[PDB]
Amino acid sequence: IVGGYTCGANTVPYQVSLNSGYHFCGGSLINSQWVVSAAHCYKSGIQVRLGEDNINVVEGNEQFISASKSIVHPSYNSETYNNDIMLIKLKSAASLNSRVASISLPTSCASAGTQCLISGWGNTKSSGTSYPDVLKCLKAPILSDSSCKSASSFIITSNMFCVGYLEGGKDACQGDSGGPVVCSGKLQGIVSWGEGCAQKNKPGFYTKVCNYVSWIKQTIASN
Ligand SMILES: COC(=O)[C@H](Cc1cccc(C(=N)N)c1)NC(=O)CNS(=O)(=O)c1ccc(C)cc1
Ligand SMILES: [Ca+2]
């Protein structure tokens, strides 16, 4: 997260770290057994880490639970990043408490202009590289279709939305991928892609979670 702030320990209790010997992506706990992340974060050997603040120190509120299976969206297109969503099932149920909690799926899509919370342990620099050990947070608005479409030379689909500031300085970044965008109290986005981080006229692109609720519910009903 570039241009954000230290969240405070366990203030974002649905935020998870995905660990394959090291932190590589974020995710969101949606119930005691399932995490939503980005399809581009797929890999084998995932351990889900719940209740984290400092990812490099055991502070006492963590739950480390291995993934049993990962399910990439059936239409995920790595060429275009269309349908950049993945479900991760836990080998055992998380113990839900004040510091480890689920975030609900949306009933309706969030509206342009809504302020959202984006969080993660990703790079904090627009130029260069600095990784924080504690969880970082950013509040930023959903952009119009017009601004989002015109914001990249690359292909933009109806399953993506933009959040941030066209003037630059505030954005998600490398290592934030897969993590949550919470708007109107529900999980509305997944950190998906961007051109660099926090650059002028180059906002973040996010998976539009409200388009996937049927697939998520059907999938978790049978796995
Ligand atoms: C990988 O390095 C980076 O610093 C950012 C990471 C990133 C990840 C998620 C969200 C954001 C964000 N700013 N909201 C940033 N990604 C890139 O900079 C990748 N862009 S890119 O322009 O380098 C690029 C473009 C197209 C292809 C096929 C591959 C790579
Ligand atoms: Ca820790």
Side-chain angles (χ1 to χ4, degrees), residues 154 171-174 177 191-198 204-206:
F154 298 109
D171 199 3
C173 200
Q174 193 172 16
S177 284
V191 180
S192 182
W193 67 276
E195 292 183 76
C197 316
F205 295 84
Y206 297 87

Side-chain angles (χ1 to χ4, degrees), residues 180-199:
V181 187
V182 173
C183 329
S184 300
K186 309 287 170 69
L187 183 66
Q188 293 282 359
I190 301 163
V191 180
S192 182
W193 67 276
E195 292 183 76
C197 316
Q199 308 195 267

Side-chain angles (χ1 to χ4, degrees), residues 52 54-55 57-59 62:
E52 288 282 17
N54 192 314
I55 51 168
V57 179
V58 176
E59 296 180 295
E62 297 92 345

Side-chain angles (χ1 to χ4, degrees), residues 73-165:
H73 195 275
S75 297
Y76 170 57
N77 187 344
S78 68
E79 300 171 4
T80 63
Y81 266 47
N82 194 30
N83 313 295
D84 189 15
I85 182 173
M86 179 177 68
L87 285 164
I88 303 166
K89 190 173 188 195
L90 305 184
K91 280 188 189 190
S92 57
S95 182
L96 304 178
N97 55 55
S98 79
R99 298 188 187 251
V100 178
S102 58
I103 184 78
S104 294
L105 298 177
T107 298
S108 68
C109 301
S111 56
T114 299
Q115 298 286 338
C116 302
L117 178 65
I118 310 157
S119 48
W121 288 276
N123 189 2
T124 62
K125 306 291 196 52
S126 185
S127 284
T129 329
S130 182
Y131 288 85
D133 300 305
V134 302
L135 186 69
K136 299 295 178 164
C137 276
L138 175 65
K139 177 183 197 144
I142 300 176
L143 305 184
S144 73
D145 288 3
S146 176
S147 298
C148 193
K149 275 173 69 183
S150 83
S152 180
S153 63
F154 298 109
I155 178 68
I156 314 301
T157 75
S158 60
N159 299 310
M160 305 169 184
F161 70 108
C162 287
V163 186
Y165 306 89

